[PDB]
Amino acid sequence: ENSVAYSNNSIAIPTNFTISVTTEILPVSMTKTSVDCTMYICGDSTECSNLLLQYGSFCTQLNRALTGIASFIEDLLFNKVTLADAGFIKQYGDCLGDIAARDLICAQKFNGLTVLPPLLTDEMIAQYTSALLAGTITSGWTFGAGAALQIPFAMQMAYRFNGIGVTQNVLYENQKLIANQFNSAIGKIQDSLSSTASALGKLQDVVNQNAQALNTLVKQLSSNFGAISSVLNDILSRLDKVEAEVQIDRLITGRLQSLQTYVTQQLIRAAEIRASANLAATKMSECVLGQSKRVDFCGKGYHLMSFPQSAPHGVVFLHVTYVPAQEKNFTTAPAICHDGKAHFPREGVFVSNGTHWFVTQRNFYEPQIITTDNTFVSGNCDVVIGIVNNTVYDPLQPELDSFKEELDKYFKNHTSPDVDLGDISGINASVVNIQKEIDRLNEVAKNLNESLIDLQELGKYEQYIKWPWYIWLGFIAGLIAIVMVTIMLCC
Amino acid sequence: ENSVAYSNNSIAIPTNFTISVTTEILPVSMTKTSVDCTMYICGDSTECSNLLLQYGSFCTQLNRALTGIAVTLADAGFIKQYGDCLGDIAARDLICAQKFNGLTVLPPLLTDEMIAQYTSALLAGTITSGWTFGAGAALQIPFAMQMAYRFNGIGVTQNVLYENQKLIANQFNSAIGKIQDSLSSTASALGKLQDVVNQNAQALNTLVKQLSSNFGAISSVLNDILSRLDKVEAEVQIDRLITGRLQSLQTYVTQQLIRAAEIRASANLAATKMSECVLGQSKRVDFCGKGYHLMSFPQSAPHGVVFLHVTYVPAQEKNFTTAPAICHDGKAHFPREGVFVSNGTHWFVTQRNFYEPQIITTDNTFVSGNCDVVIGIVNNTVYDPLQPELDSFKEELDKYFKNHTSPDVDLGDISGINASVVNIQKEIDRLNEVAKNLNESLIDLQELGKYEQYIKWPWYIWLGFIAGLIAIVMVTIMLCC
Amino acid sequence: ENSVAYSNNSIAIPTNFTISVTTEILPVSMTKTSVDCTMYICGDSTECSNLLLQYGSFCTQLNRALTGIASFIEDLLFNKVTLADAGFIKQYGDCLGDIAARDLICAQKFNGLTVLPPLLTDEMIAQYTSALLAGTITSGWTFGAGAALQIPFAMQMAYRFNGIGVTQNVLYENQKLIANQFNSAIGKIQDSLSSTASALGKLQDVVNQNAQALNTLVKQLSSNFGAISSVLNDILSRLDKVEAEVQIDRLITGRLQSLQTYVTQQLIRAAEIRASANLAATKMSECVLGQSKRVDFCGKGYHLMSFPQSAPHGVVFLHVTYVPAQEKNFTTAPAICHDGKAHFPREGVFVSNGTHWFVTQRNFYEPQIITTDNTFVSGNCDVVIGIVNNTVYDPLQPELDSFKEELDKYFKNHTSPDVDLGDISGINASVVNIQKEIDRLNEVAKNLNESLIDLQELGKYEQYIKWPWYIWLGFIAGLIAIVMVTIMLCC
Ligand SMILES: *[C@@H]1O[C@H](CO)[C@@H](O[C@@H]2O[C@H](CO)[C@@H](O[C@H]3O[C@H](CO)[C@@H](O)[C@H](O[C@H]4O[C@H](CO)[C@@H](O)[C@H](O)[C@@H]4O)[C@@H]3O)[C@H](O)[C@H]2NC(C)=O)[C@H](O)[C@H]1NC(C)=O
Ligand SMILES: *[C@@H]1O[C@H](CO)[C@@H](O[C@@H]2O[C@H](CO)[C@@H](O[C@H]3O[C@H](CO)[C@@H](O)[C@H](O[C@H]4O[C@H](CO)[C@@H](O)[C@H](O)[C@@H]4O)[C@@H]3O)[C@H](O)[C@H]2NC(C)=O)[C@H](O)[C@H]1NC(C)=O
Ligand SMILES: *[C@@H]1O[C@H](CO)[C@@H](O[C@@H]2O[C@H](CO)[C@@H](O[C@H]3O[C@H](CO)[C@@H](O)[C@H](O[C@H]4O[C@H](CO)[C@@H](O)[C@H](O)[C@@H]4O)[C@@H]3O)[C@H](O)[C@H]2NC(C)=O)[C@H](O)[C@H]1NC(C)=O
Ligand SMILES: *[C@@H]1O[C@H](CO)[C@@H](O[C@@H]2O[C@H](CO)[C@@H](O[C@H]3O[C@H](CO)[C@@H](O)[C@H](O[C@H]4O[C@H](CO)[C@@H](O)[C@H](O)[C@@H]4O)[C@@H]3O)[C@H](O)[C@H]2NC(C)=O)[C@H](O)[C@H]1NC(C)=O
Ligand SMILES: *[C@@H]1O[C@H](CO)[C@@H](O[C@@H]2O[C@H](CO)[C@@H](O[C@H]3O[C@H](CO)[C@@H](O)[C@H](O[C@H]4O[C@H](CO)[C@@H](O)[C@H](O)[C@@H]4O)[C@@H]3O)[C@H](O)[C@H]2NC(C)=O)[C@H](O)[C@H]1NC(C)=O
Ligand SMILES: *[C@@H]1O[C@H](CO)[C@@H](O[C@@H]2O[C@H](CO)[C@@H](O[C@H]3O[C@H](CO)[C@@H](O)[C@H](O)[C@@H]3O)[C@H](O)[C@H]2NC(C)=O)[C@H](O)[C@H]1NC(C)=O
Ligand SMILES: *[C@@H]1O[C@H](CO)[C@@H](O[C@@H]2O[C@H](CO)[C@@H](O[C@H]3O[C@H](CO)[C@@H](O)[C@H](O)[C@@H]3O)[C@H](O)[C@H]2NC(C)=O)[C@H](O)[C@H]1NC(C)=O
Ligand SMILES: *[C@@H]1O[C@H](CO)[C@@H](O[C@@H]2O[C@H](CO)[C@@H](O[C@H]3O[C@H](CO)[C@@H](O)[C@H](O)[C@@H]3O)[C@H](O)[C@H]2NC(C)=O)[C@H](O)[C@H]1NC(C)=O
Ligand SMILES: *[C@@H]1O[C@H](CO)[C@@H](O[C@@H]2O[C@H](CO)[C@@H](O)[C@H](O)[C@H]2NC(C)=O)[C@H](O)[C@H]1NC(C)=O
Ligand SMILES: *[C@@H]1O[C@H](CO)[C@@H](O[C@@H]2O[C@H](CO)[C@@H](O)[C@H](O)[C@H]2NC(C)=O)[C@H](O)[C@H]1NC(C)=O
Ligand SMILES: *[C@@H]1O[C@H](CO)[C@@H](O[C@@H]2O[C@H](CO)[C@@H](O)[C@H](O)[C@H]2NC(C)=O)[C@H](O)[C@H]1NC(C)=O
Ligand SMILES: *[C@@H]1O[C@H](CO)[C@@H](O[C@@H]2O[C@H](CO)[C@@H](O)[C@H](O)[C@H]2NC(C)=O)[C@H](O)[C@H]1NC(C)=O
Ligand SMILES: *[C@@H]1O[C@H](CO)[C@@H](O[C@@H]2O[C@H](CO)[C@@H](O)[C@H](O)[C@H]2NC(C)=O)[C@H](O)[C@H]1NC(C)=O
Ligand SMILES: *[C@@H]1O[C@H](CO)[C@@H](O)[C@H](O)[C@H]1NC(C)=O
Ligand SMILES: *[C@@H]1O[C@H](CO)[C@@H](O)[C@H](O)[C@H]1NC(C)=O
Ligand SMILES: *[C@@H]1O[C@H](CO)[C@@H](O)[C@H](O)[C@H]1NC(C)=O
Ligand SMILES: *[C@@H]1O[C@H](CO)[C@@H](O)[C@H](O)[C@H]1NC(C)=O
Ligand SMILES: *[C@@H]1O[C@H](CO)[C@@H](O)[C@H](O)[C@H]1NC(C)=O
């Protein structure tokens, strides 16, 4: 049997003693300590302090836990007379030539009318008057047979009336046309001017109506942009505040964890103090009011007397004990197996003086003889095995899963799409250029002066006072006289 | 005297003992533990890791706690009335003479039948005169009357033509003056219209360009606001879970700290066991191993102390009738250091742990004055915490809550702007038609030829002129001598 | 020697005992308790409970901890006269005056002809006809000289034929001038009318184009402002929700701290209950079984017997002990120094009769004599000084920096700048006023064909008197004077 219960070992048994006085101090209570969370967490920060009021009454709940702890020639000579011929006077000129006696010989036949020019030179006037007078004179002499010379007087007069009427007829038709065209043209121009005037009025009304529409739109747009700008500024200021408070809230939460551990460690320490107060209670009853047989309880050594003494937050004991002065090792065995019967001492140890065995108290060397009423006897020599694991309570720690798995249960991952606004850069509002037309109108207005009729040029009775024949002789005679003198002048 | 102090009862008193060895393990210390809070809370998540940085140094504080643990043009057509009266008879020419302000007129047309009638009238007067006294010439009157009337008719017609020519020319000059005056007004109005419509067009282009930049600025700001809002909404969701997971970390630390407090208590017990059993012999019953103590041997452990207690335990025991005290003749007797035991007829004092009955004597027992008992209660209650007590969430929220609801943003409705359109197509079509139709108002005169006749000298003047040339020439020839 | 080990103080030793019974109650377990975190923090607020759902499964972890407890020459030479029609008529009237008989004496001469107006009143017709009739009648009687009174009949008509001839040509010339000027004016007016019509057509198209460009802009702007308002309303609604939820998250975090202390204090109480269960285990082991020598352990007084009992969550002991009935104080010393050597008892105290010294048990006054087997003797009288400072663990509380120092490490302070939209109030879109031009056009459209009041007479009365031949020979002789000067130069 090589068990620890029979094999002997050397232990030191005291032989001489000395007195010791042991001062033992045991806390029994702790000071009541509060904590203001505003100073602990924020302190001097005003932003933190304002946000902390929204966190509730956690401070008074934490303090509650801590509180409970405690051629060159003709032009020169003859006067020129122009006539408007309707188509017969030119042939009359070929008829006549110069001979005035052929005035009636060939009168032109115009569209069935025998016509003659209205012109009557002095040669013809004398000829016709002489014919008229000769007929009247000779009628009486010849019993009226000599009246036939009055016929050319009448025939020429009637023919000239036809010749005057023929050209007068076209003059009247021309004047009727000129008057009718002038009235019609003025009528058409009046229509155009009224049309232009009404068109301009319709243009002005629309241009001004669109001018008010643009002005109204611009004024309304400015109000809309003012309202949008003011709303945007408020949103940005609110957004800035929220983003600041969120970061501050993160630090407040993180510092709340440190405050929580500070409270927890204070509560745990109070529990340890309460256990120390329980120990001081037993020490007061077991050491002050009695004598303890337990070694090192009530001071190191073996108890004699103890004296309590108060402390500010604890209790102080002055244990009077006797401790060993000198000791020597002795060969001791817990039990000895004598022929299969284990013997062990009751209240003692088996000490050996080298040869025999003895029973002595554990705290003093005083060998005694082993007697029947000094030791117990066991039937067998075997031993009983027991195991005692004084384990402390193993806590059930949290079993958190992955952060992503916990987040995915209720997370709302959202992304706002970009604001898409219509593009108005394609609006043209083109311009107009009509300067060429305006220049044309101003040019025609200036040029319309040239179409004015000169009233001084209309009734123009042109007349040249040609030289009479008797001065032509004098001019010729004088011209000859003014050169014959030069004959003598040269020499 | 019915108390439990005097009534006897049966208990088991050991009679034989056997050696036992008890191995007792006592933790005295704990391994140092450090918690990685980023790994504990976030782990592999990156959004949590960046957000957890803003919570401060709580991880160091937790680790510190755990580390320490270890006279317105009309009226000239009197030919119409003359033609109607005449009836194409050629003899009523003189009878059908019209009038004009007392001037009898006849048209200047004389057909060959009329000419014969008037000439024969002229001829008849000349012949008949004389042969019928002087009264015969009266047939010459119609010849003179018709010619004089035709002279008046020509003079009247030429008068109305000149008057109408004067009227048309005078009217034309004044009409032209007015027209070119209205052309300047048309050109002036068009110049003013063009300037305004061009100025308005440039105003629209300027407004459109400015609006596009304003809408570009608004869109960029709104996109930035939306991006910031999406970040904030996601972050407040994440730090809700971080705050909730911080509670699990706190309980993890708290339970580690409480376990350390228990270990410290177990370290104190191991120190007590070492003093009272390794260095002494214990009189306590099962302190330091089951059964009564004999010897103990300490042994080191990785984080504790292992005790090899050698004790002796009862092997066989038999039940005995015992009483804590015995009331004899009014005085209670109780043993000092023992218990009363009964053999069946007598009483003895024996040790509580071994049956070795002894005779009751004065030195074995104590005597009390009376037989009453003293009643006491020891209520060893544990500390009852002052748990937090909170109000309702509703009445703790409205103390500082700010219930806000932004009113809907409204903007002025601009859909009422009209910008009406113009339609002057009727006037433009009229102007183009009149411009095209003014050609028909051109005057196409009936052309009259121009004949020019010289009034030549009469032959008798020509003869005289030649005679004058002859006379002057002969005088010059006389001077030439 | 002045220490407490030789103090000679006085203590009270029992001399008479009385049976006592002590009922000791020890808790050994806690009831199974769990916390409803949603009810604990929110209670009945739906907004809190919805937000608390996102805080994770902390409730399960907390309950896990709690559960585990339980014509380169003509111009140059001849005088030129050009009168008007009105002047000729006025001149003729000056001749005639009122006497309708001087028609022939001053008949005008024009361009070599003799002219008279083509008008005969009834007086002139009577005068000429009576002239013609007289010439015919008297011709026979007067023997030819009576026919002389017939020339004025012939002369008057020939004069009037010539006068008509020259006045028809001028009338045609007036028509030619009027027609030519009228046709030229019509062409110019045609050009201005087409130019006006084209200018109006360009203006109308541009005005209509601008109006359509404005309308499409207005329609697009309204849609853009509709999109802006809808996105702004959504942002505002999102902002209100975030700000409300931020405040609620603050109160939830604060209330989580108090719940954490509730769990912590429950866990600490369990540790104390487990400690009390250990004490009950030793009490059952040392009082119920076996007799304890520890005073006041296993009930007040000195242990006799104990009887266990069952409790709902604990154990009840019925400790039978004997307590001191009466006791008298006694003068005693822990040890008496004799002959320089300390004397202390073996498991007792040194009581004194007042004259001698005795050894007695601490719990009973039964004095005995002092022998070598009743006491110990030390070598010297000195005492050993020892101190046992039973300090409880001092936790390492958190050491936080200032809030500002911790916040500035990762703070992202940022204020969004104010928005500044462009100003569009400077757009005028001016209006037009052409009412004067429209009024002038509409007036001319009415006054164009109005008849004049002061028609101006046609023609002119200019006279171009040229040099007579009197100075023409003088001019020729002046050339001869140049000739004779050259002759004088030669000679
Ligand atoms: C007195 O009782 C105490 C309380 O039970 C015992 O402490 C326990 O010891 C065991 C064994 O070491 C330990 O179990 C775990 O220990 C390790 C923790 O991770 C781990 O390695 C262990 O796994 C082992 O066992 C399994 C099962 O076969 C094998 O698959 C593995 O390969 C490995 O071998 C095991 O999980 C306890 O944790 C520990 N308790 C505490 C609270 O720490 C004492 O050992 C006991 N003493 C005696 C002398 O009996
Ligand atoms: C519980 O234990 C009690 C204490 O031991 C017993 O009482 C004792 O019993 C013994 C034995 O009978 C007795 O001893 C003597 O009794 C007589 C004198 O008192 C005397 O006559 C006896 O002598 C007889 O027995 C011996 C034994 O060998 C013989 O030699 C003699 O020849 C003779 O036969 C004996 O010496 C005690 O006196 C007695 N005590 C008292 C106080 O009376 C109880 O009996 C016991 N109970 C039970 C139920 O066993
Ligand atoms: C040892 O100390 C323990 C801790 O103090 C005591 O337990 C206490 O027991 C009392 C009752 O005796 C109990 O008080 C409350 O218990 C209930 C919880 O609210 C409640 O029902 C009780 O109501 C009482 O009063 C009303 C009206 O008067 C009666 O109708 C009830 O019947 C009842 O009497 C009372 O409010 C403590 O809570 C409880 N404490 C603990 C921690 O459990 C032991 O009683 C004490 N033992 C001895 C022997 O002294
Ligand atoms: C504290 O205890 C001390 C130790 O007991 C006491 O000392 C003892 O005192 C007694 C009483 O006097 C004494 O007993 C004997 O003393 C004498 C022999 O030494 C002897 O003469 C005495 O006999 C006397 O008294 C009896 C009784 O009346 C008479 O019959 C005699 O005739 C005679 O008068 C007596 O037998 C002890 O010897 C003595 N011890 C020592 C060591 O001296 C203290 O007195 C005591 N103190 C107090 C204050 O009580
Ligand atoms: C048993 O152990 C206890 C725990 O260690 C001891 O109490 C400790 O005592 C010290 C010393 O006083 C104390 O430290 C601080 O105490 C004061 C804090 O309020 C402070 O005044 C002290 O300042 C001291 O030291 C500085 C620098 O060294 C000097 O300038 C001062 O003049 C002064 O000397 C010091 O900071 C511990 O706080 C205190 N602990 C506890 C838990 O109370 C007991 O003294 C000890 N008992 C014995 C008998 O040894
Ligand atoms: C919320 O949804 C977000 C949607 O944009 C998402 O951000 C983006 O996530 C994708 C997918 O993980 C990332 O894409 C990158 O990763 C893939 C995976 O291998 C690779 O092909 C490339 O690396 C690719 O770039 C985006 O980078 C990421 N965007 C940003 C800005 O990080 C968020 O992850 C979602 N949030 C949560 C909490 O789940
Ligand atoms: C403070 O903010 C609260 C959150 O927006 C807001 O809650 C709203 O409360 C009203 C009633 O006060 C609810 O209206 C409901 O009323 C009854 C409830 O039984 C129903 O019959 C109605 O149909 C209606 O649902 C709102 O629904 C509720 N709003 C939300 C978003 O939940 C409070 O009103 C705010 N306080 C003030 C003074 O305005
Ligand atoms: C984030 O930055 C902010 C500026 O962008 C800052 O707000 C400004 O803080 C300064 C002081 O740092 C204030 O200055 C004022 O100081 C005292 C306190 O009122 C006054 O007596 C002075 O006259 C002076 O005005 C600014 O007024 C203040 N600006 C605003 C708009 O409030 C924040 O403090 C910064 N936040 C953090 C958490 O650091
Ligand atoms: C057309 O001719 C008239 C005259 O008949 C011009 O009128 C003259 O205008 C000038 C300035 O241009 C003035 O100094 C004169 O006094 C005006 N004269 C008269 C008589 O009124 C007229 O200007 C001409 N038209 C244009 C467009 O120039
Ligand atoms: C004395 O002797 C034995 C023990 O030695 C007792 O037997 C016990 O009886 C109780 C009755 O409740 C049982 O629960 C135990 O299991 C028994 N123990 C054994 C070891 O068998 C017996 O009851 C006692 N006799 C008297 C009269 O008290
Ligand atoms: C008036 O008549 C002239 C002469 O015919 C027209 O001139 C013609 O105009 C047409 C249409 O523009 C052209 O195709 C011809 O080539 C032109 N001919 C000549 C000879 O110029 C003139 O347009 C007419 N005015 C109108 C229609 O308003
Ligand atoms: C003498 O013993 C008596 C008891 O028998 C003690 O008397 C009591 O002492 C306590 C503690 O000081 C006081 O509170 C009581 O008031 C005392 N009782 C009486 C009735 O006075 C006494 O203290 C002891 N003497 C000494 C010196 O300790
Ligand atoms: C000048 O022209 C005007 C144009 O308004 C003529 O006035 C109109 O003439 C028409 C002829 O049919 C009448 O029916 C209208 O009643 C007249 N008045 C208006 C206001 O339109 C006017 O008659 C013309 N004058 C001349 C002399 O021809
Ligand atoms: C052990 O039991 C036996 C049974 O016969 C008995 O005789 C003996 O006395 C007992 N031993 C002790 C030490 O009591
Ligand atoms: C508007 O009028 C202001 C003066 O009032 C001028 O300076 C500016 O150019 C004008 N703008 C437009 C677009 O007409
Ligand atoms: C106890 O008091 C009684 C009287 O009540 C007395 O006779 C007795 O002696 C006292 N006890 C002791 C041990 O002195
Ligand atoms: C101690 O007190 C006792 C009381 O009996 C007395 O005899 C002794 O002389 C005292 N000793 C000292 C040193 O005071
Ligand atoms: C204790 O010490 C003393 C003084 O030195 C000595 O005489 C005595 O023998 C010692 N005691 C024992 C038991 O050896």
Side-chain angles (χ1 to χ4, degrees), chain B residues 377-382 384, chain C residues 23 25 269:
Chain B
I377 322 284
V378 178
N379 198 348
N380 257 327
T381 41
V382 308
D384 205 31
Chain C
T23 313
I25 313 172
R269 198 199 139 84

Side-chain angles (χ1 to χ4, degrees), chain A residues 28 43 56 79 109 181 211 274 316 360 388 456 468:
Chain A
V28 303
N79 237 314
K109 301 265 312 171
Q181 299 300 86
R274 282 197 298 272
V316 174
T360 178
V388 175
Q456 324 265 293

